[PDB]
Amino acid sequence: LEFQHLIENYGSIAPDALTVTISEIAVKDVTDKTGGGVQVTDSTTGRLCML
Amino acid sequence: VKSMWSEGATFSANSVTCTFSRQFLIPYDPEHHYKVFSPAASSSPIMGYSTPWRYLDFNALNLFFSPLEFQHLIENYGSIAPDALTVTISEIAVKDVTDKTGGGVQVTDSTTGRLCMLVDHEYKYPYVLGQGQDTLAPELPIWVYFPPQYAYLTVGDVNTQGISGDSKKLASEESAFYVLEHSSFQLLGTGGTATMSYKFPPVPPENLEGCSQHFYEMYNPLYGSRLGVPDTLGGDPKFRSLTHEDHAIQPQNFMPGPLVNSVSTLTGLSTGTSQNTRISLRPGPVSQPYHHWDTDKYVTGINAISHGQGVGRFPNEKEQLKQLQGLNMHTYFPNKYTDQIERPLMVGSVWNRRALHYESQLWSKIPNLDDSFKTQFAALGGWGLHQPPPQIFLKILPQSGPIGGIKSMGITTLVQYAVGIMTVTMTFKLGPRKATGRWNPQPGVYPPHAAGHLPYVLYDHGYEKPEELWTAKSRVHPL
Amino acid sequence: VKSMWSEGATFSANSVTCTFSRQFLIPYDPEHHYKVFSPAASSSPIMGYSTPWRYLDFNALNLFFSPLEFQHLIENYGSIAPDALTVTISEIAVKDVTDKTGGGVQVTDSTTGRLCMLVDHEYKYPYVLGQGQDTLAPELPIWVYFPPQYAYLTVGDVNTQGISGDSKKLASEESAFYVLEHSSFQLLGTGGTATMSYKFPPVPPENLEGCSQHFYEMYNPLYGSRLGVPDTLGGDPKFRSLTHEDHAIQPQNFMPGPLVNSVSTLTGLSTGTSQNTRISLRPGPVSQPYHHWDTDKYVTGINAISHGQGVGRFPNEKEQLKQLQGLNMHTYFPNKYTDQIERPLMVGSVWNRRALHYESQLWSKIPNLDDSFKTQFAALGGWGLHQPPPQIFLKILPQSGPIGGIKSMGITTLVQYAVGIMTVTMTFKLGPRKATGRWNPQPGVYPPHAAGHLPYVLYDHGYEKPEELWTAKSRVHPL
Amino acid sequence: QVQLQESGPGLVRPSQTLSLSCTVSGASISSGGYYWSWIRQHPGKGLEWIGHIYYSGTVYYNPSLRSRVSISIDNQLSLKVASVTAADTAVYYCARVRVDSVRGAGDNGFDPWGHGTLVTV
Amino acid sequence: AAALTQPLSVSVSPGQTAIFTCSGDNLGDKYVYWFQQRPGQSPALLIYQDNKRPSGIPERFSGSNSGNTATLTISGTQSTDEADYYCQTWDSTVVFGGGTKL
């Protein structure tokens, strides 16, 4: 709908800005239930290296 | 100072100002009489007066908007309502023919002839402007407007004089003879200009957007219904509950609107006496369609008007077939089922409207008789309002020479005609489009055609209009 | 206030202001229709519209400059580029013919007729001005200009309807019908004046000076060359050095420009489908000559345009034959020699230009489609620019009497025509001449002729133009 | 094609109601805008117009023969001229006119005529 | 115009003129061409652009074009001008006339 509103109303397009926000991160760890196979708790000490 | 021919619409997020300009031509009247009538019906006859004046009728919508501008109106906005109107009569060139007697016609130019222009701001004279007759304006700006002659019907006293049954409406005490020369008359010579400057009342908008939802299907398609529905009848009810599959017996909190004589394929629906007086109320009320598209073909109704051509040019009211209206829509009653074609008003009801199109009217007039309901929207398209845009009457003058002292020399009305330019601007308060979190591309806005013969374009008077009317409800609400 | 007919160029060390004035004549149209077309080709046909308007085309260079003023331009300056343009429509005398019926024609004067003038500052309507057609202006200021009728081609939808192979371009959704009466219209009566006042974009100059040096011979004629040239081939090169006599194998640091189908003596060079659609790209690119002088005669090319007459009137491009271009110029490759007539672009290249002359264009238009290269200079002469000087459309009016009330009396378009004066001024930013420590008298600036028949002068319509075109590169740079 | 056929009673001298009828073949008469005239012509003299009628009851008459004649429509196009003490017998045509657009001047003329009946008085 | 009007035949004697009529709506602002078709032969361009004659046509043929009509005047008709004369215009395709049989 927004692309259709773009085509039928305007006559040019060119980008000028871009922001990329990495929101809420929930790095967690699997504990390997050995009979269930997978149990996911949550980790507060694990991190996510972003470059 | 610059003299301009103005035309073109300028859009905004608020109102659009659309002006057009045509060339008019006040032709001639060899007799400046009033010429009552002589109808003399034989079966309530009519009784009129033929004024020697020219009014002008810029009523329709296809004059203010070009087809590109109407397409820009539909695909961008979601309402329309007029709020201002000015009518400027530009450069006037009243001239006279000298009758070459061997050539026949030689047109010089007259600086002493004038053009009597009267604007009826007080609504003293009868209003014949908004009834849908074949003298409006040229659709294209290159053709010349010939404005219509002014005439009106009155009420008299029906007699019966003749041999077999001849009736004739003669003048009564209630009959009236409006001579327009008892007024103020901008005399408006060669090169003169005159304006009107009307201001529209607050009118409800026309909502140029359809619906993506039936009004009787507004529920969650799951979950059933909290209420019940009868099973047994005869004093022992034994109500049962509902599941999610009970769609044909789901209880609605709002009823549909009235459908007084909606049928398919004379006089149509008609009031009157026994079987033969029978005046017609032809295009139904405004709450009814007269043309839509069922599963195979187009259903066309008894109460339809053609808008041209014949085969007819009808607006496809697909937004009335959706919300529980349509042509062959009967109502049923379990009275000790009674198939009825008329549906009543049903105190809580919604019936949206018959849709406006590209060639529809703008106003008609609500008559001065009291206690109207609802009358905010007229039939034949348009709004319809108390105190409509006033009529601009245009006579030329009876310059009446020569004499010679006793003789009736010459023609004594010599011959004169006036050309000019009328530039009519009107502003329409547009509303913003209704919001949809839709994710689908909305359907495109193009006028309907069938094959090869394209809409408004010149072909090998050339220019041809489509087979169906270009309606205005093509985007979805979402209700 | 004084009413003047202005004409004449005024030179400076900076820009020259050259104005001219002609008498135009907006003739008549007995039908104010739009008159689409009916081409119906049989072998992609065309599809047009014939507007009832008159534009004016002051494109060429021989109108702003007299031959004395063009000679003063060439022998004194070394560049030219326009920077301003005003078009004034002076005293207008729209009049009407009364049809003497025994004489045939009697022209009185009309004060109520007008002349609709529209200037297209927004570029809404298609631009047909700069394509080189036989309706520009009179070359001499004593003749009367008849401005051309406005018409345009569009894109439609090719069908195949007939018996054998008859195609016809009908209207599509992309086809357009520009009615010019949806605009603003200076109505411009008798005695009225109107202006345009365009301002040219920054354009690169035209450098009216040749070269006294070949571009491939820019070295010291002594001293040889520091680099080497191969002797043996086949994996064992054995390069050798160079002496001062090695002129045909001297290494150049700049290549020549492209020569895409430069040949000597239909459609010329042409794109298109298999062998018969084949639209022509006739006067080559701007990097190529189509007429010069070899050792014996004049070589004239396939891709030449005649500019008049036939035998032809071609500009002598002696400044392209100098710098490694020309007609029969093949390129050779030692691939396992391959004679090619096309030369590629060759990343470091210089190709100076096809020279402008006295009768060349000034602008054409760069089309609105994107990614142009190089397009700063058009073919057929001239610059060629985005947003060119706008078109001035001139209709008169359809004054449409008389009527008589019902009758179609008279001719109803009575008859009218308008004469006037258009005074067009344009300023050209001239550059100073390039310096030479030369000691030789530079060659004189005179238009080319052969014997007896002198250039622009009256003879026993009299006035005759030379056989060859008067080019503009006759002084030397010195490169 | 549209043809109009008349119906003649014969001759009655002592002041009876002269009744005629005109059945139209080819196209119905309650199908749109067309007048339906009754036109006389004295043998040895010019034409004379009695009156015309529309299908919705409205009928125009001649001002000289207004209080004598009566045009009517029951898909029959009758004519009931009475008081025949003046011996007018002449000829009775039927004629059709297309209804004009502006009501002021006649835009059309009597293109489809009848065959004509000869009444005697 | 799109339908040119021309009568059937004209009668003349040697020693006078025979003027024909080529009627047409707005024919004054148009070009009318006359064609001489002797019997058994193809037509020949008699008078072009309402006044002019070619070299093969003698100087006794002349025409006019005024108002809604275009005439062709023969000055001193001989005993060889008994030929069908057609008027022809261009209403955007080609419009041929009926022909005055002389």
Q: Is E61 helix (H, G, I), strand (E, B) or coil?
A: strand
Q: Tell me the DSSP string of chain A.
A: -HHHHHHTT-S------------------B---SSS---B---SS------
Q: How far is CA D60 from CA B131, C47, D52, D53, in A?
A: 26, 54, 6, 6
Interface contact C405, partner D, CB < 8 A: yes
> CB under 8 Å, gap of 24 or more: what pairs does D60-64 form?
D60/B38, D60/B39, D60/B40, D61/B40
Report the distance separating Cα B207 and Cα B471, nearest Å. 12
Report the distance separating Cα C57 and Cα C60, nearest Å. 8
Report the distance separating Cα B315 and Cα B305, nearest Å. 10
DSSP tag of E66? B
Closest CA to C300 of C283, C323, C281: C283
Q: Which residues of B touch A9 (CB under 8 A)?
A: 76
Q: Cβ(B363)–Cβ(B59) under 8 Å? A: yes
Is A1 within 8 Å of B76 when comparing Cβ atoms?
no
Q: Cβ(C450)–Cβ(C34) under 8 Å? A: no
Q: Cβ(C84)–Cβ(C404) under 8 Å? A: no
Tokens (6 digits) for B301: 């109704």
Q: Which residues of A touch B441 (CB under 8 A)?
A: 1, 3-4
Contacts of D25 (CB under 8 A, 6+ apart): D2, D3, D4, D5
Name residue, tokens 């090619």.
Answer: C340
Q: Is the peptide bond before C374 cis (omega within 30 degrees of 0)?
A: yes
Q: Using CB atoms, which chains have 3+ pairs under 8 A with E?
A: C
Domain count of the fold of chain E: 1
Q: Is E22 helix (H, G, I), strand (E, B) or coil?
A: strand
CA C333 to the chain's CA centroid: 37
Report the distance separating Cα B15 and Cα B81, nearest Å. 9
Rg (CA), chain B: 28
Q: Cβ(C462)–Cβ(C140) under 8 Å? A: no
Which amino acid is located at A7 in the chain?
A: I
Report the distance separating Cα B190 and Cα D36, nearest Å. 46
Which amino acid is located at C152 in the chain?
A: Y
Is E26 within 8 Å of C101 when comparing Cβ atoms?
no
Report the distance separating Cα C379 and Cα C286, nearest Å. 5
| Determination technique for this entry | cryo-EM
Report the distance separating Cα C81 and Cα C15, nearest Å. 9
Domain count of the fold of chain B: 1
Q: How far is CA C191 from CA B174, B191, C147, C184, C418, in A?
A: 56, 15, 19, 20, 11
Report the distance separating Cα B448 and Cα B469, nearest Å. 8
Q: Using CB atoms, which chains have 3+ pairs under 8 A with B?
A: A, C, D
Centre a 10 Å sphere on the Cβ of residue B420 and count the other Cβ atoms it contains.
Answer: 23
CA D101 to the chain's CA centroid: 22
Query: Which residues of E touch chain C, with CB atoms under 8 Å apart?
Result: 26, 29, 66-67, 92-93
**Positive or negative: CA dihedral C168, C171, C176, C178:** positive
Tokens (6 digits) for E20: 């024909």
Report the distance separating Cα C474 and Cα C445, nearest Å. 7
Is C101 within 8 Å of E92 when comparing Cβ atoms?
no
Burial of C59 (0-12, 13-18, 19+ CB in 10 A): buried
Count CA atoms closer than 13 A to B451's CA, side-chain side.
1
Report the distance separating Cα C337 and Cα C345, nearest Å. 20
CA C282 to the chain's CA centroid: 14
Report the distance separating Cα B198 and Cα C88, nearest Å. 39
Q: Cβ(B429)–Cβ(B438) under 8 Å? A: no
Pairing of strands E69-74, C331-333: unpaired
What order of strands is seen across the sheet that includes strand E61-63?
E18-23, E69-74, E61-63
Q: Which residues of D touch C405 (CB under 8 A)?
A: 104-105
Q: Write out the E strands in C206-289.
A: 225-229, 240-242, 255-256
Report the distance separating Cα B226 and Cα B251, nearest Å. 10
Q: Cβ(B340)–Cβ(B346) under 8 Å? A: no
Closest CA to C412 of C31, C13, C53: C31
CB < 8 Å from B in window 1-51 of A? 1, 3-4, 8-9
Report the distance separating Cα C415 and Cα C407, nearest Å. 19
Helix (H), strand (E), coil (C) string for chain B:
CCCECCCEEECCCCCEEEEEEEECEECCCCCCCCCCCCCCEECCCCCEEEEEEECCCCCCCCCCCCHHHHHHHHCCCCECCEEEEEEEECCCCCEEECCCCCCCCCECCCCCCCCCEEECCCCCCCCCCCCCCCCCCCCCCCCECCCCEEEEECCCEEEECCCCCEEEEECCCCCCCCCCCCCCCECCCCCCCECCCECCCCCCCCCCCCCCCCCCCCCCCCCCEEEEECCCCCCCCCCEEECCCCCCCCCCCCEECCCCCCCCCCCCCECCCCCCCCCECCCCCCCCCCCEECCCCEECCCCCCCCCCCCCCCECCHHHHHCCCCCCCCEEECCCCEEECCCCCCCCEECCCCCCECCCECCCCCCCCCCCCCCCCCCCECCCCCCCCCCEEECCCCCCCCCCCCCCCCCCCCCEEEECCEEEEEEECCECCCCCCCCCCCCCCCCCCCCCCCCCECCCCCCECCCCECECCCCCCCC
Closest CA to E96 of E70, E72, E88, E44: E88
Regarding chains D and C, contact by 3 or more CB pairs under 8 A is answered as yes
* Structural domain boundaries, residue B415: 1-479
Q: Using CB atoms, which chains have 3+ pairs under 8 A with A?
A: B
Name residue, tokens 């055609």.
Answer: B449
Is B458 within 8 Å of C34 when comparing Cβ atoms?
yes
Q: How far is CA E8 from CA B12, B101, E97, in A?
A: 67, 29, 11
Q: Cβ(B53)–Cβ(B33) under 8 Å? A: no
Report the distance separating Cα C18 and Cα C9, nearest Å. 4
Nearest to E29 among C30, C35, C104 (CB): C30
Closest CA to C379 of C359, C403, C356, C406: C356
- Resolution (Å) of this entry: 3.2
Interface contact C404, partner D, CB < 8 A: no
Tokens (6 digits) for C426: 């344009």
Tokens (6 digits) for E6: 């021309």
Tokens (6 digits) for B346: 């049903």
**Domain regions of chain D by residue span:** 1-121
Q: Write out the E strands in C291-415.
A: 292-293, 298-299, 331-333, 338-340, 349-350, 392-394
CATH number for position B116? 2.170.30.10
Pairing of strands B349-350, B255-256: parallel
**Positive or negative: CA dihedral E40, E41, E43, E44:** negative
Count CA atoms closer than 13 A to C52's CA, side-chain side.
19
Report the distance separating Cα C39 and Cα C41, nearest Å. 6
